[PDB]
Amino acid sequence: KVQIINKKLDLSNVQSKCGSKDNIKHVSGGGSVQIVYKPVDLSKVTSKCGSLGNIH
Amino acid sequence: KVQIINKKLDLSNVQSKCGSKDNIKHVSGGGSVQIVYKPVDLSKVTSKCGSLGNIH
Amino acid sequence: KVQIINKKLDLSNVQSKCGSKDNIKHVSGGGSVQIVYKPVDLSKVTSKCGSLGNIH
Amino acid sequence: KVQIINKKLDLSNVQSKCGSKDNIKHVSGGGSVQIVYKPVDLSKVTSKCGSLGNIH
């Protein structure tokens, strides 16, 4: 059989019979507590501009 | 058989017989508590502009 | 058999016989508590403009 | 058999015999409590403008 794979950026997960226990028990803060659990961030924040002119 | 795959950006998950226990038990804050659990963020925030002119 | 796949951005999930227990038991805040659970965010916030002119 | 797939942005879920228990038991806030559970956000907020002129 012929096979071709062409990936630019690979984070593919493949598992079989895999266990995973993750605990976060006791977190205290005097101020502001922030907990971010398994985030995935593909967000873009862009500002394109073509031909900007600032004459004085 | 012939097969071709062409992916630019791969985070494909494939699992079989996989267990996963995730706990967040006790979180306290004096101020503001924020908990974000498994976020996925593909959000865009853009500002395109073509030919901006600022004459004075 | 012939097969061709062409994906730009892949987060496809494929599971079989997979268990997942997720708990968030005790969260307290003096101020404002915010809990965001498995969000998916494809939101866009854009501001296009072509040929902006600011003459003075 | 011939097959062709062409996807720009894939988050397709495929499961079989999969269990998932999700709990949020005890959340307290002095102020404002906000809980957002499995949101999906494809919302757009745009402001297009062509040929903006500001002469003085």
Swiss-Prot record, chains A, B, C, D:
The modification N6-acetyllysine is found at residues 8, 17, 25, 38, 44, 48. There is a cross-link at residues 8, 25, 38, 44, 48 (Glycyl lysine isopeptide (Lys-Gly) (interchain with G-Cter in ubiquitin)). Tau/MAP repeats lie at residues 2-32, 33-56. Disulfide bonds join 18-49. Polyubiquitinated. Requires functional TRAF6 and may provoke SQSTM1-dependent degradation by the proteasome. Phosphorylation at various serine and threonine residues in S-P or T-P motifs by proline-directed protein kinases (PDPK1, CDK1, CDK5, GSK3, MAPK) (a few sites per protein in interphase, more in mitosis), and at serine residues in K-X-G-S motifs by MAP/microtubule affinity-regulating kinase (MARK1, MARK2, MARK3, MARK4), causing detachment from microtubules, and their disassembly. Phosphorylated by PHK. Dephosphorylation at several serine and threonine residues by the serine/threonine phosphatase PPP5C. Expressed in neurons and at a lower level in the liver and kidney. Isoform PNS-tau is expressed in the peripheral nervous system while the others are expressed in the central nervous system. The modification N6,N6-dimethyllysine is found at residue 38. It is found in: Cytoplasm, Cytosol; Cell membrane; Cytoplasm, Cytoskeleton; Cell projection, Axon. It comes from the Eukaryota. The modification Phosphoserine is found at residues 12, 16, 20, 32, 51. Interacts with MARK1, MARK2, MARK3 and MARK4. Interacts with SQSTM1 when polyubiquitinated. Interacts with PSMC2 through SQSTM1. Interacts with FKBP4. Binds to CSNK1D. Interacts with SGK1. Interacts with PIN1. Interacts with LRRK2. Interacts with LRP1, leading to endocytosis; this interaction is reduced in the presence of LRPAP1/RAP. It is linked to May be involved in the pathogenesis of cytoplasmic inclusions (as Mallory bodies) in livers of mice chronically intoxicated with Griseofulvin or DDC (3,5-diethoxycarbonyl-2,4-dihydrocollidine), a model for human alcoholic hepatitis. Alteration of Tau (abnormal phosphorylation and cross-linking) could contribute to Mallory bodies formation and disturbance of microtubule function in alcoholic liver disease. Promotes microtubule assembly and stability, and might be involved in the establishment and maintenance of neuronal polarity. The C-terminus binds axonal microtubules while the N-terminus binds neural plasma membrane components, suggesting that tau functions as a linker protein between both. Axonal polarity is predetermined by tau localization (in the neuronal cell) in the domain of the cell body defined by the centrosome. The short isoforms allow plasticity of the cytoskeleton whereas the longer isoforms may preferentially play a role in its stabilization. The tau/MAP repeat binds to tubulin. Type I isoforms contain 3 repeats while type II isoforms contain 4 repeats. This is Microtubule-associated protein tau. The gene is Mapt.
